Amino acid sequence: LVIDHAHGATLVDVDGNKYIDLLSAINVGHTHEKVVKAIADQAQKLIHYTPAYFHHVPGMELSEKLAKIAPGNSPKMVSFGNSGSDANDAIIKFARAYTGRQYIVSYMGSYHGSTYGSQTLSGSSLNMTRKIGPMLPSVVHVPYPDSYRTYPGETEHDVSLRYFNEFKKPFESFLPADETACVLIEPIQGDGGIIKAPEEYMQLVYKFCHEHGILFAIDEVNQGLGRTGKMWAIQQFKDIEPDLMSVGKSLASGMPLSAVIGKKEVMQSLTAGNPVCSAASLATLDVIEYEGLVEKSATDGAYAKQRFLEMQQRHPMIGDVRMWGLNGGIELVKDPKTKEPDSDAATKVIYYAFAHGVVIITLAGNILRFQPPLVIPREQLDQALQVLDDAFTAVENGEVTIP
Amino acid sequence: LVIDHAHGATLVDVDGNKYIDLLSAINVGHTHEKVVKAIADQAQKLIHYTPAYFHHVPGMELSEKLAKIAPGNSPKMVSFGNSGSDANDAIIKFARAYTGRQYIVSYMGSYHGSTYGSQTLSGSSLNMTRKIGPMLPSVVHVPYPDSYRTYPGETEHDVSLRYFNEFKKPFESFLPADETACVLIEPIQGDGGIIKAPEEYMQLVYKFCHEHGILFAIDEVNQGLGRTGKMWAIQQFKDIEPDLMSVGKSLASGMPLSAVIGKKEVMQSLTAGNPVCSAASLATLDVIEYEGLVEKSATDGAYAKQRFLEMQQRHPMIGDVRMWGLNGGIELVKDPKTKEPDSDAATKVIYYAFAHGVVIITLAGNILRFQPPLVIPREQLDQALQVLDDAFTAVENGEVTIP
Amino acid sequence: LVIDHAHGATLVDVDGNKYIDLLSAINVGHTHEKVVKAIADQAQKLIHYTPAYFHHVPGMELSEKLAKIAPGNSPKMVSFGNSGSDANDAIIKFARAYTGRQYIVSYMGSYHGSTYGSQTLSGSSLNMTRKIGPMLPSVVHVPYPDSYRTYPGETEHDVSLRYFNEFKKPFESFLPADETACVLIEPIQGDGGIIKAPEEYMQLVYKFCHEHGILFAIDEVNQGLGRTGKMWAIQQFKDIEPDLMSVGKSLASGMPLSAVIGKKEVMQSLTAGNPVCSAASLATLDVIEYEGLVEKSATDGAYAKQRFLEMQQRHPMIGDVRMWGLNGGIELVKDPKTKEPDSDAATKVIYYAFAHGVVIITLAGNILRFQPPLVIPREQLDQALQVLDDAFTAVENGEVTIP
Amino acid sequence: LVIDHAHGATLVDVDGNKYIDLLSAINVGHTHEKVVKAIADQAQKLIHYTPAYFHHVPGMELSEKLAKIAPGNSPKMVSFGNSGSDANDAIIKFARAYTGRQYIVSYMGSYHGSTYGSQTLSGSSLNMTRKIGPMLPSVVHVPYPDSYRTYPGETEHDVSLRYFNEFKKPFESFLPADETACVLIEPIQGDGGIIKAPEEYMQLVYKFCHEHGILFAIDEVNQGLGRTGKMWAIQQFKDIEPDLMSVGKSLASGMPLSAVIGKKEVMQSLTAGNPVCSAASLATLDVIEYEGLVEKSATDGAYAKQRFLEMQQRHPMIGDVRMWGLNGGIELVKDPKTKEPDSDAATKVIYYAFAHGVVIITLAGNILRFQPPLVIPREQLDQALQVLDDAFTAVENGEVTIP
């Protein structure tokens, strides 16, 4: 299929068919009027310049704003790239350079990018890593805490301790803490299934890092910029200021711009952004702030969560409803007690939806990924929610078949 | 300093000062009317979309065009990124995947990017590699042929054989040819000093690769899209069709878009581009074709070469004039016979120029990098050339001092 | 201190003080009469020869014997080195070469050697890895099953499933099974604390390997040659034939000789031994066979286990008694219920023992390592056991202080 | 074939056929009476002991002697292994640990061992590296100076400058000098063809290392212990004290013992030897000293060199005669002016010799390796030399055919 154009949460194919976008670099929705104008005004003045002798204003303005909105009060610096991948690659460099150490710890289930560094940190789609090794050396992966498929009787405190214990094992065997430059964590894993780490777990890792001189880095490529109902996913957690943070194309409404924002002394251990993409980004941040999208995601998120929890009541194929902001994973299982994945039911849901004007896809075969643009109007949100309920019903009753 | 706007080969700072741009993602010049309009028209329809269920038209059109204009007649496929760095990273993957081998050979003096893969292939600025290792494994660097500082009495044939002999040594010691996935070469090194490899040398390497099943890959990030007076720098060489080729932001007039273009069977061994940047790229290629910029670079290049060779006659500090298209390296030496670098004279030249409205910079301390936009009007080209002649004179007579 | 000489399980310092050896390349005891004579007879004929045109007989004889006694019935080949380290390094090569794959999986807690390959596989003493990285690429570590410090209520089946689940996580995230050349496991970890893997766990890993084309390799450097009461530690497990197996200096009574013994087709994927050390090894194997040391270790092992389990009854500082053959780990804890390690009590035990003519040391601060020579006479075994009981008493009553 | 026994420079197969040994861990010859007795006396007292609480005397004595005889006057420490491979692996660790840097530079043509570290440093037989990668990261290879196949008109000074220039290129491109822990060099390459580096070349590299804080390490596994007519091959060079040096099994007459001997402060940056092998080594060093083998190799070496240079006069297939001590490479070429290798003539020479009771082999197809035991009696040396002359004649006249 072929998309012609889009606006807000609506996609329009070449034959004029309309769909509701449930899928992300689209926090502010498609073709926001302010972003369009920023791109157009800025292309008229300056598409590109090699930075040697000169600076541009959108760049310096954007840079100053991101330093401020970044989590915590410690002074920051900002380094621009073109995508998540190259930002996460840079995090490795910044961390190594600053600490003089070489190991990096990253999580199983994570997705950090497709360049050799960020790919090596990743733990999602090995297909991505097949036949392309060796990868970057001195990287270790540890398991990300899973709150759904747990052991019988486990509290959140059990799950936090158990996983923090897995975290330490490498450090108790072959990986010297004093030679680890940083830990990189998605405060909520996206490609992993919209899996959020328990609060205590994160405090343990954080305290561990500080106690052994290891930088604490986060990836907010998918979960930042209001997606969770706070500005930054890490703000779902109590009093945590990371040393380094990555941001992706969401920054510029899907135009290719990225950043790393870090504590000044870390960033001095070792560039400037596309001006048209910087324009788009200033407009984008303005829309998030003035349209109150952080708050909107929180409020609609809580709404969505209730709507999904109620659908779950009539629809046992819904194993788990996870939602923080308009950010959710609706995990389908063949049976509530075994939690067996039902990739087949999920495929059926998205094809039904698709067929009724709702665009959505999955993670890990069986989890629906719900991340509509934050600007989504309540009417469309409700249409889409209804179509989904319907989809569950059709599938429940065997009324859905994929060609 | 701060740039406000630019058009063609003219930069304009915030105080309305004008400069002539001698510096590259600017083949078609600044703010070309067609590129501006493509960006603006396309932002109105679609800034970004996640590609899952949908394709966009600019993407498919761009893709088809690049398949065709790419060097050789073998069917091609095209894979899009956001920059040179991530394209060169991909070249590694594509090569490995296809061949099932792991080693990669790259050249000393090269610059391929700043992500961990392309950075590891690079051989220019170790500063870039300081404190950030380990780099990517299974990469070997070999020396790039230097035609200026050669041994007494050396012909182009001597230089070609000598360097091809260095090339083979690894293969005769620790690097098994049958385990090398590819060789990546800039047909003319850019960051290296605008150093072009001798024709015979390139045939040797090429034939070597084919004879041992090694993919032959080129980087045209800096030297492609008409910069040399042919479409692709590799076209300066007789009957060479690479297996893989990288292209950078020049593709979209400095908007963040890249590509790898390769033989179909290689590319099947293992994405889609930003639509606004794809729009910019279609406009950009159209300008190169209809404005005859390939031919223009050839013709102005030959003009520039004569103008520099004549300046050299009155200015012995000019050791070497290298030029293929409007693509040149004007290498300054303290003495014609010793060839000692004179980084100091070069710094003085650029500061004089700067002060007389000409923006230019250096490579390796002492080489002037001449790569103005291809659309440069002859009047400005001549102004800039004159200012340079002047600069040589001032510096010759000790009239130039840096604060 | 300085040792002058030794015989059986007795060490004698330069001042004629006698000690009982509880510490291993000493399966057959010190200075066995047959080993001494083999060394002496063979030194008279041939200390060393470069193998080019010639073979030696001890070498071919030793080779044929080890092929036969190795676990399983599949034809084998034997490749000789000088130590465990270089045998485990070779296992990596053999595995890679044969499979055409690159990743290797090894266990946390393991000790495989001190050369860069075997060191990278290791998971015991990071001190060993401090400041010497980067290590060898494409190695992943997983946790070795711990049967003592487990979760409340865990059966052996829980522990087996839980740990096999940790094993799979890498394979479910970033490590492609089809690109893993082998898994290397100590059927009982030695440096790790004399920790034996549960039977079901091992069947799972084994079946996993076979199902994904991964070679199953074992380290018997510490636990082979009758140490466990079977010839090979892997024989404690039902019907398991490894693809590769490493053996260390025990082979030649601590003379420097090692081997890898593997399935013929694996070993053809890609040397010969010191003749004097091969002589020592033939004598050594003869002593193990005719003196019935496999059986002796089993019988004395069961005796030792009862004697330790009874000491545990009066000595609660003994948290865990682990023993398979004359191969044991007597783990000291500050409290039976918390299992807190008591490194301090252990240090006190060995100093008491030492002072009463018993040489023994620890693993992980708090575990006594019991591995006397297999030939140990029952009288000495009993003396040493008694001294230990005493040591526990002294320490219990605060009668022991380290200078 | 099968060797039964040997003594001095004589090998004896199982059928009582005698051969003269021209091939090395055999500096003192086969079965020297003193070495045999040391092995036998020491096996009677102590074959092996785990070093924890105890030291042995042969170990401390050997250690003290090697500290003293090592090149230079700076205090030294000695660390023992079982072979060249594991000594060269350790050199990497020692160097890294001390400097806090990670890169290592090693030479094309070199052979340092077969464990993953020393193998990665090696540059001789890629077969050894086929299908076993990835190798150890952060290693770079540079070319070893070749004095035979040089460019027309080159002096030793040209060859020294040219090669030192190749040495620097990496450092001028991608390899930061301040991040290189050491350079490891064979002062005369053995497996490479008995190729000795020019004096000036070595001073340049040495001075380079000192000027950039890089440790200067040498391999004397093949060329040490009097092989060159000085104790250590590095003593062929003016006033050079290495930071680290490796020694192999020659130390103990082919018993498995190795060492690293280094400047004390380097060695403190981060074991003990087999007592029977340490005994053999003390005897071995005594034989070298009292039998004047350093001097003998010098004198016989000069004799051998004249005898080969004269054979060359009647035998043009001898391209190059290289000899320093009883250490030589007699390189066969198809034509004196082209220097084409004649692997075929070499194979014929060794088969003729073999057939007339002389054991010798080749390097690189066409170079005869001459390294008889140093104790060789002049009568046998002369027999063997004569047989070789004969061999050249037979081959010259087409009288030699391999089955």
XYZ file of N, CA and C in Angstrom, chain A residues 332-403:
216
model
N -1.602 -10.363 24.309
C -2.531 -11.433 24.111
C -1.957 -12.788 24.502
N -2.733 -13.581 25.239
C -2.324 -14.942 25.608
C -3.402 -15.956 25.237
N -3.011 -17.176 24.877
C -3.961 -18.321 24.707
C -4.714 -18.758 25.954
N -4.194 -18.459 27.144
C -4.819 -18.856 28.403
C -4.319 -17.978 29.553
N -5.211 -17.422 30.375
C -4.744 -16.495 31.421
C -3.761 -17.084 32.389
N -3.952 -18.348 32.751
C -3.088 -19.001 33.757
C -1.681 -19.451 33.161
N -1.642 -20.059 31.982
C -0.354 -20.406 31.397
C 0.362 -19.197 30.796
N -0.355 -18.168 30.423
C 0.262 -17.038 29.743
C 0.916 -17.374 28.396
N 0.467 -18.445 27.766
C 1.056 -18.814 26.489
C 0.821 -17.701 25.470
N 1.822 -17.354 24.687
C 1.622 -16.292 23.727
C 0.691 -16.718 22.647
N -0.114 -15.803 22.145
C -1.030 -16.108 21.083
C -0.767 -15.129 19.976
N 0.262 -15.425 19.213
C 0.670 -14.628 18.101
C -0.386 -14.673 17.053
N -1.141 -15.753 17.037
C -2.107 -15.927 16.005
C -3.306 -14.977 16.208
N -3.803 -14.881 17.423
C -4.885 -13.945 17.728
C -4.504 -12.486 17.467
N -3.257 -12.155 17.753
C -2.781 -10.801 17.526
C -2.762 -10.413 16.056
N -2.170 -11.249 15.227
C -2.231 -11.070 13.774
C -3.646 -10.865 13.242
N -4.591 -11.553 13.869
C -5.978 -11.455 13.478
C -6.572 -10.132 13.879
N -6.239 -9.697 15.094
C -6.670 -8.364 15.545
C -6.204 -7.265 14.630
N -4.950 -7.267 14.218
C -4.463 -6.132 13.422
C -5.033 -6.104 12.021
N -5.221 -7.281 11.437
C -5.909 -7.411 10.152
C -7.412 -7.001 10.204
N -8.109 -7.350 11.270
C -9.457 -6.833 11.424
C -9.456 -5.329 11.497
N -8.662 -4.781 12.404
C -8.536 -3.341 12.589
C -8.196 -2.713 11.264
N -7.150 -3.218 10.654
C -6.749 -2.623 9.428
C -7.968 -2.508 8.522
N -8.620 -3.635 8.286
C -9.794 -3.677 7.464
C -10.916 -2.687 7.887
N -10.958 -2.253 9.156
C -11.933 -1.252 9.635
C -11.304 0.137 9.934
N -10.193 0.414 9.263
C -9.590 1.737 9.256
C -8.725 2.050 10.461
N -8.156 1.016 11.048
C -7.274 1.256 12.155
C -5.930 0.599 11.967
N -4.917 1.442 11.935
C -3.560 0.968 11.789
C -2.874 0.750 13.144
N -2.498 -0.501 13.369
C -1.790 -0.922 14.534
C -0.932 -2.162 14.227
N 0.156 -2.369 14.948
C 1.001 -3.552 14.784
C 1.419 -4.099 16.120
N 2.210 -5.170 16.061
C 2.602 -5.904 17.222
C 4.059 -5.901 17.513
N 4.319 -6.295 18.756
C 5.627 -6.603 19.291
C 5.625 -8.032 19.800
N 6.674 -8.758 19.478
C 6.913 -10.129 19.927
C 5.812 -11.108 19.530
N 5.200 -10.893 18.356
C 4.121 -11.753 17.878
C 2.757 -11.448 18.458
N 2.687 -11.401 19.778
C 1.421 -11.341 20.497
C 1.111 -10.035 21.307
N 1.932 -9.001 21.252
C 1.581 -7.798 22.008
C 1.168 -6.660 21.088
N 0.000 -6.096 21.340
C -0.411 -4.973 20.543
C 0.308 -3.751 21.059
N 0.829 -2.975 20.133
C 1.500 -1.768 20.474
C 0.577 -0.564 20.249
N 0.246 0.093 21.343
C -0.652 1.217 21.322
C 0.114 2.509 21.613
N 0.371 3.291 20.580
C 1.085 4.546 20.788
C 0.612 5.587 19.810
N -0.666 5.991 19.920
C -1.115 6.918 18.910
C -0.482 8.296 19.095
N -0.592 9.173 18.110
C -0.045 10.483 18.377
C -0.713 11.107 19.591
N 0.020 11.920 20.320
C -0.507 12.464 21.542
C -1.662 13.421 21.306
N -1.629 14.104 20.179
C -2.692 15.035 19.838
C -3.980 14.328 19.469
N -4.052 13.012 19.617
C -5.222 12.344 19.063
C -6.533 12.923 19.627
N -7.466 13.288 18.756
C -8.763 13.741 19.265
C -9.534 12.597 19.903
N -10.197 12.874 21.010
C -10.985 11.853 21.730
C -12.003 11.062 20.891
N -12.577 11.686 19.880
C -13.531 11.025 19.011
C -12.831 9.861 18.304
N -11.676 10.136 17.692
C -10.904 9.099 16.984
C -10.323 8.032 17.933
N -9.933 8.479 19.096
C -9.409 7.580 20.063
C -10.488 6.572 20.350
N -11.712 7.070 20.532
C -12.853 6.221 20.833
C -13.260 5.324 19.672
N -13.201 5.826 18.448
C -13.503 5.013 17.293
C -12.557 3.838 17.283
N -11.292 4.124 17.589
C -10.235 3.132 17.412
C -10.331 2.105 18.504
N -10.563 2.579 19.706
C -10.845 1.683 20.801
C -12.044 0.698 20.540
N -13.092 1.227 19.941
C -14.267 0.465 19.648
C -13.945 -0.592 18.612
N -13.214 -0.182 17.577
C -12.865 -1.106 16.521
C -12.084 -2.230 17.144
N -11.235 -1.925 18.123
C -10.412 -2.968 18.739
C -11.277 -3.966 19.503
N -12.112 -3.460 20.407
C -13.141 -4.287 21.058
C -13.850 -5.193 20.061
N -14.201 -4.634 18.919
C -14.876 -5.398 17.930
C -13.958 -6.504 17.490
N -12.739 -6.134 17.162
C -11.740 -7.081 16.687
C -11.584 -8.267 17.639
N -11.682 -7.997 18.938
C -11.504 -9.056 19.906
C -12.661 -10.013 19.789
N -13.867 -9.460 19.834
C -15.098 -10.196 19.515
C -15.006 -11.039 18.202
N -14.757 -10.420 17.064
C -14.653 -11.210 15.853
C -13.712 -12.379 16.082
N -12.565 -12.115 16.673
C -11.568 -13.160 16.731
C -12.002 -14.267 17.682
N -12.522 -13.866 18.849
C -13.180 -14.743 19.837
C -14.120 -15.746 19.165
N -15.023 -15.236 18.326
C -16.017 -16.028 17.567
C -15.509 -16.649 16.257
N -14.209 -16.812 16.083
C -13.679 -17.296 14.796
C -14.141 -16.572 13.510
N -14.631 -15.338 13.576
C -14.973 -14.631 12.326
C -13.822 -13.953 11.580
N -12.558 -14.318 11.784
C -11.504 -13.557 11.091
C -10.519 -14.500 10.486
N -10.266 -14.325 9.191
C -9.302 -15.156 8.457
C -8.360 -14.338 7.524
N -7.062 -14.555 7.727
C -6.015 -13.936 6.921
C -5.810 -14.740 5.614
N -6.057 -14.106 4.427
C -5.714 -14.657 3.103
C -4.510 -15.608 3.057
